[PDB]
Structure formats: C-alpha cells, structure tokens
Amino acid sequence: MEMEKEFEQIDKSGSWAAIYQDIRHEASDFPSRVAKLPKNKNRNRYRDVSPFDHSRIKLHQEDNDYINASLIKMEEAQRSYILTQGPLPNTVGHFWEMVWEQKSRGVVMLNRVMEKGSLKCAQYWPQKEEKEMIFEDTNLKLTLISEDIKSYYTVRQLELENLTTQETREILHFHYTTWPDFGVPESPASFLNFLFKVRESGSLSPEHGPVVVHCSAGIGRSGTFCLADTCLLLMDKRKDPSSVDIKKVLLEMRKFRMGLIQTADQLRFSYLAVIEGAKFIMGDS
Numbered sequence: 001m002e003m004e005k006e007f008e009q010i011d012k013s014g015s016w017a018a019i020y021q022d023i024r025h026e027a028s029d030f031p032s033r034v035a036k037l038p039k040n041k042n043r044n045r046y047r048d049v050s051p052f053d054h055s056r057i058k059l060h061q062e063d064n065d066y067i068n069a070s071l072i073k074m075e076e077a078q079r080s081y082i083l084t085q086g087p088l089p090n091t092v093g094h095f096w097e098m099v100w101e102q103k104s105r106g107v108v109m110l111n112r113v114m115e116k117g118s119l120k121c122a123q124y125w126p127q128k129e130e131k132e133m134i135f136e137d138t139n140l141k142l143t144l145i146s147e148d149i150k151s152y153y154t155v156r157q158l159e160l161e162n163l164t165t166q167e168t169r170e171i172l173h174f175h176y177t178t179w180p181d182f183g184v185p186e187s188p189a190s191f192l193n194f195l196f197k198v199r200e201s202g203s204l205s206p207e208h209g210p211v212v213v214h215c216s217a218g219i220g221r222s223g224t225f226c227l228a229d230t231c232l233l234l235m236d237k238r239k240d241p242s243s244v245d246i247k248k249v250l251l252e253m254r255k256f257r258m259g260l261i262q263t264a265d266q267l268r269f270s271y272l273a274v275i276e277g278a279k280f281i282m283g284d285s
C-alpha cells in the first residue's frame with residue numbers, strides 16, 4: 001500500500017502495536033559473540049543491545065578492537081551510517097578513535113546528557129574554547145572551535161588532532177536538544193528541519209566517511225533518523241515514489257543492527273516524518 005493512506009488505515013484501526021510486533025518477529029537474528037566476551041562488559045551500556053559481529057566497527061588496535069557500534073550500509077539509497085551507543089566514561093577515547101579512523105565529518109546526538117534525572121551518556125566534548133580535552137588512551141586532542149545554539153538544536157565546530165601524527169580535522173557536532181523525556185514529538189517539523197541541516201553540511205555525503213549517530217542505546221531515536229533519511233532519498237531516486245515501503249526499509253536496516261525503532265510510537269512518528277517531509281521536498285505541506 002501507499003504510505004499516507006496505510007497510515008490513516010492503521011490510525012483508524014488502532015493497530016500500531018500489532019504492526020510493530022510483526023516487525024519484531026520478522027527481524028534478523030545474527031551472532032554478537034565479540035560483544036558478549038567478559039573483557040568487554042564495561043564497554044556496553046545495556047546488556048540487551050549489542051552489535052552483530054558481521055557489521056560491527058573495529059577499532060584499529062591489536063589489544064582490544066571492540067566498540068558498541070554498527071555500520072548500516074544502504075545499497076539502493078547509496079548512504080551509509082554508523083549507529084552507536086552514547087559513550088561511557090571508559091569509552092570516550094574509543095569513540096573519538098572511531099570518528100578519526102572511519103574519516104567521519106559529522107556526529108549526530110539525539111539525547112541530552114541527563115534525562116529523567118539519570119545520566120544517558122558521558123560529557124564527551126568540551127564546553128569551553130579554552131578548556132580542551134585530551135584522551136590519553138587513544139592519543140587524541142579535542143577542542144571546541146565555535147557553538148551556535150538554536151531553539152531546537154545546537155551545532156558545534158570541533159577540532160580533532162591525532163597527537164601521534166599532528167594531523168588535524170574539523171568535525172561538526174549536530175545536537176538535537178528537544179526530544180521529550182517521554183514519548184515522541186507531537187510534530188515532526190523540527191526533527192525534519194534538523195535532518196536537512198545535517199544534509200546541508202556535507203556530513204552525509206559520499207566524499208566523507210559515514211556519519212556517526214547516537215542516542216543513549218543507539219537504536220531508537222537513532223533508528224528514526226536514518227530510517228527517515230533513507231526513505232526520503234529513495235522517494236527522490238525512484239520513478240514511482242509511492243513504491244517506497246517503510247516497513248521493508250526498516251527490516252533491511254535491522255540486518256545491520258538489532259532493535260532499530262524501540263516502540264510503536266517511534267514507528268508511527270517515523271511514518272509521520274516521511275509523509276510530511278515528502279511534501280516539502282517538492283510543495284503540498
């Protein structure tokens with residue numbers, strides 16, 4: 001079926017939970033043996049969210065190459081994403097090592113450091129120009145260059161230096177700051193505006209390594225971001241945009257990381273975002 005009318009048909013019939021449970025039943029199951037080794041316990045935030053072995057990002061280290069991060073490679077859309085958990089106190093150096101080694105331009109953050117009164121990720125970037133951060137375990141230096149605070153998101157320019165070679169690179173930090181503590185946003189307008197700002201920066205383009213996107217576990221909000229982006233790109237590429245099947249795209253992405261889209265409300269919100277976005281790309285919003 002088309003998307004917008006499939007959407008109203010699920011609303012009128014109130015069957016979002018059944019649709020979402022079907023997706024959970026059909027999703028791929030691949031091994032995640034490296035994630036479960038005892039030496040990696042303090043490298044995982046949640047015991048039930050792990051990268052598959054076949055798609056995990058490897059650090060360029062011989063001691064321990066493990067990080068909780070996955071490469072999502074979308075062949076028809078010609079887009080790749082790295083989805084990862086929010087960094088832990090003992091993985092902030094690994095996180096920036098990955099950004100460096102994978103040649104990423106941008107980092108997309110979809111959570112606040114504290115939500116619901118609890119810590120959701122480490123404070124892993126510097127908050128003042130004159131107070132830079134040094135990660136001694138991976139030999140990197142990180143400096144805040146500029147910060148632009150807007151009503152729904154903040155963009156930061158960061159300098160990452162490999163202290164071993166003295167090479168430097170500019171990284172863009174795109175921080176969506178207004179996702180609610182509970183539930184999903186009422187309107188997708190600010191989330192779509194944010195997606196378009198990431199696109200306009202070059203951070204999703206083939207002349208760079210894959211964007212790094214995270215929330216707390218790296219599957220819920222993070223899944224919504226890449227699912228919406230890929231579906232909109234396919235609608236632009238194909239002769240028949242109504243052929244884009246958001247459930248099929250989501251199942252394809254779940255071949256590369258488990259659990260993407262965590263609730264039926266996140267699934268409905270993803271439909272809403274693609275539907276509204278497809279009107280702005282052309283003229284009927």
Ligand SMILES: CC(=O)N1C[C@@H](CO)[C@@H]2Oc3ccc(Cl)cc3[C@@H]21
Pocket residue numbers: 155156157172200201202
């Ligand atoms: C650094 C810079 O000049 N630019 C312009 C665009 C590509 O030329 C990129 O989009 C953004 C957005 C936000 C920030 Cl802080 C920087 C950028 C980049």
Ligand SMILES: CC(=O)N1C[C@@H](CO)[C@@H]2Oc3ccc(Cl)cc3[C@@H]21
Pocket residue numbers: 188189192193194196276277278279280281285
């Ligand atoms: C492409 C798209 O569908 N959308 C949805 C709009 C809000 O409904 C978003 O913000 C922008 C801004 C500029 C452009 Cl070209 C596209 C958009 C987004």
